[PDB]
């Protein structure tokens, strides 16, 4: 047990990071392009889709940096300021993406309960909500903004981009932040999204029980259930790992094998959250029946230009 | 199986006195070359060198 752990996995991590990066950087780019200059704005849920796609886009834009970081086996070349900026930027876009998923589920719930709310829906109120969500994500990324720095790890002989908690009370701090990551990153959003899904399913189930209404209603129900299932699938492993890590920092679990498994699996789970950010555009923007026709129109844009 | 549990103890030992208790249990199990090696690891636990006694008892 007490023997030093394995390093076999680090060969595959950067390549996977690049795969996820190119996939999400294409898909999210497609979404943001359809929204940005091409007409299609002026809807609240649409504004939310755009902001989520921007958060995921700028989020995966940092994946090459982490793939290089894992390629050089934790030796950070770009400097301490870059470690600060891109760590806090990463955390900020994680919180923006997750908070935007929650905000879109809340928007769907409050649009299902209230059938008489127009699509404009006081668009300036969304022009106030979007900065509110971004500011909440910033405030939640303040710990990562204060502790993500470059420190010299002598035993690895490596200038690593880590969380630079006070080494006297390092472990404690780690545990704390881990729990915070669980609460502000999974627990509260999971509660919101789950309750919203349950309520939406209930109201729908009442409204459109018979006929073609039942068919389309079951489709939309599978859409909301698919939202919750995607979030859970691509965020439960990471947060379970961070919770067990928090237990280790506390000292409840000290087994060498368990902690070695935590550190072995953690980069994969981080990548899994990033794959959630990559998958969201398929789940939210590409589902509309107007999307495929708009895609065929974009595809024929240069042909008509000829 | 008792020797396996006391071999878990040293890796999970809080201090030297837990190592001493586990090594005395192994000594009683042995009575129920290994005896001499355990009698030396018991010395290492009594000295207070906790980490070195853990390494000796793992052997």
């Amino acid at each position: 047990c007490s023997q030093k752990p394995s390093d076999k996995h680090l060969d595959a991590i950067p390549i996977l990071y690049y795969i996820i990066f190119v996939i999400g950087f294409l898909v999210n780019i497609v979404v943001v392009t359809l929204f940005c200059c091409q007409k299609g704005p002026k809807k609240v849920s649409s504004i939310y889709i755009f902001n989520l796609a921007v958060a995921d886009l700028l989020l995966l834009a940092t994946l090459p940096l982490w793939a290089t970081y894992y390629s050089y086996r934790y030796d950070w070349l770009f400097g301490p300021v870059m470690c600060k900026v891109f760590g806090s930027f990463l955390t900020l876009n994680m919180f923006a993406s997750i908070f935007f998923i929650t905000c879109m589920s809340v928007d769907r719930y409050q649009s299902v309960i209230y059938p008489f709310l127009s699509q404009r829906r006081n668009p300036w109120q969304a022009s106030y909500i979007v900065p509110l969500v971004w500011c909440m994500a910033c405030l939640s990324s303040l710990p990562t903004f204060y502790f993500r720095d470059v420190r010299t790890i002598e035993y690895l002989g490596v200038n690593a981009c880590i969380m630079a908690f006070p080494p006297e009370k390092y472990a404690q701090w780690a545990a704390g932040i881990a729990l915070m990551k669980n609460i502000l990153g999974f627990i509260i959003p999971l509660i919101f999204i789950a309750t919203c899904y349950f309520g939406i399913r209930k109201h729908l189930l009442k409204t459109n029980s018979y006929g073609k209404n039942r068919i389309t209603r079951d489709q939309v129900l599978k859409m909301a259930a698919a939202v919750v299932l995607a979030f859970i699938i691509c965020w439960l492993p990471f947060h379970v790992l961070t919770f067990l890590d928090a237990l280790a920092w506390m000292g409840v679990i000290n087994s060498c094998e368990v902690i070695a498994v935590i550190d072995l699996a953690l980069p994969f789970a981080i990548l899994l959250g990033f794959t959630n950010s990559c998958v969201n555009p398929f789940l939210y923007c590409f589902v509309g029946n107007r999307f495929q026709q708009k895609l065929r129109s974009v595809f024929r844009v240069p042909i008509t230009w000829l | 199986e008792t020797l396996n549990d006391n071999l878990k103890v040293i890796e999970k030992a809080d201090n030297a006195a837990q190592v001493k208790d586990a090594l005395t249990k192994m000594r009683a199990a042995a009575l129920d070359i290994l005896v001499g090696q355990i009698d030396d690891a018991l010395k290492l636990a009594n000295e207070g060198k906790v980490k070195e006694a853990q390494a000796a008892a793992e052997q």
Partner: antibody, heavy 120, light 107 residues
Framework: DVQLVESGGGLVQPGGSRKLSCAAS????????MHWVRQAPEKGLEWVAY????????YYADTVKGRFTISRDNPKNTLFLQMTSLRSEDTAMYFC?????????????WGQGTLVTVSA | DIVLTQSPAIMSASPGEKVTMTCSAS?????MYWYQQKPGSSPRLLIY???NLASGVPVRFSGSGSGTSYSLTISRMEAEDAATFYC?????????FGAGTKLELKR
């Protein structure tokens, strides 16, 4: 199968300069730290310097610090050690060694070594 | 700046005997490593992190120690084991080596 090969040895007058090179094969080079470690004739081993994978962390021995410069060429899988103002005590057999594990301060895989003599 | 003194400098050991050499540091050292070097060949890592058998090292070798006192032990002396044994400390760079111990096969 890991192979490290040193080269660049020979006879240098006191105060000269000499760049030793180390070629590596059999592993991903730009993931681990490399050390230079010399051994005096009929004497024991002595750690000289160390450089990380992306050359961000560099350590020198106190008898070497300020006079030598360890460097790295990752695209070509090479480890360089520029020696300047050589002394009689620097006469030794130099090795490039790595732990092949995150650049930890030990030496699992040793090179063949190259001899450097300092005498006029 | 940590000085490593090994004991003894020379020792004869017949095949099958138990060999034990010591390595003492002037200050508290975090980790100790043990290398075997035969005349003409490069050293080979025997023990890393003061008690962990390195990959490929026979079971006869075993490292131990803590604080300022460490030891390398061979359960059953064999012919291939006759070489010079070095200890290297790590607590903070720079790294320092030991003076060495010559293990001669008693004939």
């Amino acid at each position: 199968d890991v192979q490290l090969v040193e080269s660049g040895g020979g006879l240098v007058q006191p105060g000269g300069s000499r760049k030793l090179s180390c070629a590596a094969s059999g592993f991903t080079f730009s993931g681990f730290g490399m050390h230079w470690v010399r051994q005096a004739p009929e004497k024991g081993l002595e750690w000289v310097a160390y450089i990380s994978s992306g050359s961000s962390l560099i350590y020198y021995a106190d008898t070497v610090k300020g006079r030598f410069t360890i460097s790295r060429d990752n695209p070509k899988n090479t480890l360089f050690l520029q020696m300047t103002s050589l002394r009689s005590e620097d006469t030794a057999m130099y090795f490039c060694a790595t732990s092949l594990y995150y650049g930890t301060p030990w030496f699992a895989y040793w090179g063949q070594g190259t001899l450097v003599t300092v005498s006029a | 700046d940590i000085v490593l003194t090994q004991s003894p400098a020379i020792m004869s050991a017949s095949p099958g005997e138990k060999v034990t050499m010591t390595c003492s540091a002037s200050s508290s050292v975090t980790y100790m490593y043990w290398y075997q070097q035969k005349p003409g060949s490069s050293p080979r890592l025997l023990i890393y992190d003061t008690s962990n058998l390195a990959s490929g090292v026979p079971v006869r070798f075993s490292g131990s120690g803590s604080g300022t006192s460490y030891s390398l032990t061979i359960s059953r002396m064999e012919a291939e084991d006759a070489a010079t044994f070095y200890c290297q400390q790590w607590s903070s760079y720079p790294l320092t080596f030991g003076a060495g111990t010559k293990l001669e096969l008693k004939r």
